[PDB]
């Protein structure tokens, strides 16, 4: 089995999958809404209890077994083969809606290449009767039905929501946005076909370019008037909110969505590695800096919308009343065009949203191609240049339901209802498989032989008690009441939760089927055919 090139190669990819473009809007918006500066207090207690040790055990299975996604269960407990088959179809399900997010930013790159941006004026073919964002000298008013010019460029031209009605009519995919999918998917295919050799070099440019982009964008907001109003609503501690049980669960779901452990993507990094490296130091620095990136990237957004609170003359909660991916392309996009030298700052920000998205889908394609190779030798991936080409075309044709004119409605149901509870259910079932079924007394023996020391008292109790109980509280309150996903004054029908749960449980129905697949083919006494499939060979 091959390995990485240098030592710092695979330490740069674990942080690169940990950070994405989701860390700039999904984290700091729940901070400002739920008590301001008091939201950082559950961010550091729930990380050491549920975030960090569950992030650590996924590397420990990949370090010793040095196998893929599906073959690690062959030497632990073979009934849990449905875990690795579940994450394969979510990787086809994630790549349908996730690549459209940078495709909106890739269209913004060619649109903002000119000197005159279309966001500082209403000189276009949108609904110009509501495009009245010019701030005159006390002769300006907007009726309930008015819109923003950043919204009209997002809804009329890119998504074309006027051409559709909702889930009943999706129609004909935009041809201009379809060309952006071909520009994205070319760079994905030309970096994974060789393996870890080209994957070890492409991250050297794409994982540090957004980090230097956070530095040049912070000095823009630092010497910016009205930036002190944004840090006021961000840092003010409100301890009256923490008595509610709702803010505790939403803070616990944020750390799990940011790092994203147990999905099978990260264990491919530890498979192509020597056993002599300290996994304790490699896992501790990644979870520490990821809180540091989400703290720094909250400063570059809230200091700019504080200037929007000055010009539009409202509170920062009123200008940020939306909740979702529209925080970057509606509110933050219009703030760049009103700045001097707007041609330079618009490119470096919208290319930052490009590079943070492609690091997550660089590694996500490696986790699905490594699984089919080791379980079926000399059957799949005999020629590595051809068999990964069959993988990339399936998520290309699968994304045709997301490139429609009603494409904004399908990415809302698939992010929250479909892939939302699916990533918790696949991660809780693997947490009890290694802890209870495989045994906590057996698991620490493989860690001390590759390191040289036994783990402490904190790591032994939290692997059996805290980490199964950490994901149980989040999945219970999520299946309490179906929320109403409001997207541009269009209310979803009552059967939207029915179709949303059915596409979400299609991966979750695979795991009770795959435990039933082996108890049929394995003959003998009903007690003996089970216990043969818990204890490995």
């Amino acid at each position: 089995r091959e390995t990485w090139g240098k030592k710092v190669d695979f330490l740069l990819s674990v942080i690169g999958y940990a950070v994405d473009l989701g860390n700039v809007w999904r984290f700091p918006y729940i901070c400002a809404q739920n008590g301001g500066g008091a939201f950082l207090l559950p961010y550091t207690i729930m990380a050491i209890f549920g975030g960090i040790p569950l992030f650590y055990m996924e590397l420990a299975l990949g370090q010793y077994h040095r196998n893929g996604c599906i073959s690690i269960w062959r030497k632990i407990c073979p009934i849990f083969k449905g875990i690795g088959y579940a994450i394969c179809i979510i990787a086809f399900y994630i790549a349908s809606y996730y690549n459209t997010i940078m495709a909106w930013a890739l269209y913004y790159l060619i649109s903002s290449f000119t000197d005159q941006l279309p966001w500082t004026s209403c000189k276009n073919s949108w609904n110009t009767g509501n495009c009245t964002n010019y701030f005159s000298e006390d002769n300006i008013t907007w009726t309930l039905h008015s819109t923003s010019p950043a919204e009209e460029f997002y809804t009329r031209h890119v998504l074309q929501i006027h051409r559709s009605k909702g889930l009943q009519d999706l129609g004909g995919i935009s041809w201009q946005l379809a060309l952006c999918i071909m520009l994205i998917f070319t760079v994905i295919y030309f970096s994974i076909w060789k393996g870890v050799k080209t994957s070890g070099k492409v991250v050297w440019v794409t994982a540090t370019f957004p980090y230097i982009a956070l530095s040049v964008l912070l000095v823009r907001g630092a010497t910016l008037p009205g930036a002190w109003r944004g840090v006021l609503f961000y840092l003010k501690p409100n301890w009256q909110k923490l008595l509610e049980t709702g803010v505790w669960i939403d803070a616990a779901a944020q750390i799990f969505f940011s790092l994203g452990p147990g999905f099978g993507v990260l264990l491919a990094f530890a498979s192509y590695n020597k056993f002599n490296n300290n996994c304790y130091q490699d896992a501790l620095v990644t979870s520490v800096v990821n809180c540091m990136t989400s703290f720094v990237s909250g400063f570059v957004i809230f200091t700019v919308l504080g200037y929007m609170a000055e010009m539009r003359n409202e509170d920062v909660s009123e200008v940020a009343k939306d909740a979702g991916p529209s925080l970057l392309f509606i509110t933050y996009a219009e703030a760049i065009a009103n700045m001097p030298a707007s041609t330079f700052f618009a490119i470096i920000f919208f290319l930052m949203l490009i590079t943070l998205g492609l690091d997550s889908t660089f590694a996500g394609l490696e986790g699905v191609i490594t699984a089919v190779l080791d379980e079926f030798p000399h059957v799949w991936a005999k020629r590595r240049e051809r068999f990964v080409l069959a993988v990339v075309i399936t998520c290309f044709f699968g994304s045709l339901v997301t490139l429609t004119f009603g494409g904004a409605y399908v990415v809302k149901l698939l992010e929250e209802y479909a892939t939302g509870p699916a990533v918790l259910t696949v991660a809780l079932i693997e947490a009890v498989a290694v802890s209870w079924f495989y045994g906590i007394t057996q698991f620490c023996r493989d860690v001390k032989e590759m390191l040289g020391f036994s783990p402490g008292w904190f790591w032994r109790i939290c692997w059996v008690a805290i980490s199964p109980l950490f994901l149980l509280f989040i999945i219970a309150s999520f299946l309490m009441s179906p929320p109403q996903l409001r997207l541009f004054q269009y209310n979803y029908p009552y059967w939207s939760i029915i179709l949303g749960y059915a596409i979400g449980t299609s991966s979750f129905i695979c795991i009770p089927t795959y435990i039933a697949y082996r108890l049929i083919i394995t003959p003998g006494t009903f007690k003996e055919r089970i216990i043969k499939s818990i204890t490995p060979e």
Partner: antibody
Amino acid sequence: QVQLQQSGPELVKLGASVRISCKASGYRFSYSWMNWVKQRPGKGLEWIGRIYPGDGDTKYSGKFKGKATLTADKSSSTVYMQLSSLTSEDSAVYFCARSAYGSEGFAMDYWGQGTSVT
Amino acid sequence: DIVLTQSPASLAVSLGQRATISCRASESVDNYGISFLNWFQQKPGQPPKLLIYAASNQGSGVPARFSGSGSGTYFSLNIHPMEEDDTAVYFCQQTKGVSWTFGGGTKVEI
């Protein structure tokens, strides 16, 4: 309601300058365009240009840049077209029309009375 | 500039008969769903009054004897059985940017 009032007519001679205006009232002229159309008795229509007030963008086509200079101002709430170096063949009828928004397809809902530039 | 012509040059419709008028062009201005093609009606002494919003919806101040539909590179305005008071000229107008071109016009007679 919305009205568009032009100025009086003017006789065309060799080397004269004719200034034509069109006052906008009853709506917000900063969020719309101002179209101009050529009209000759016995011929059809022809597009000249547009004025988008607020920022100063002006588009020219159909070789009318050499004689027609389209300039407007937000404070007095009207537009102007500065004509220069006229001949006898440049005699035509000018109109100003209010353009609708992009949802209606930039249509000319209202029109002026038109001046006789000959 | 986009080439925009008009045919025929003159039509003779009797009392109680229907007709149609088209605008020949190379575009296909069908961008983002809205058909970028307008219609006008200029009378002698009157300005070219608007008829239909983007060849799909009747506007204000227009009588109910006018309609229009079509798709692609060929439209057709639907005219009711006309009377003697409809002596005017109809024009084409493609409003797709950045340069606009107008039609030639046809003579309406009885």
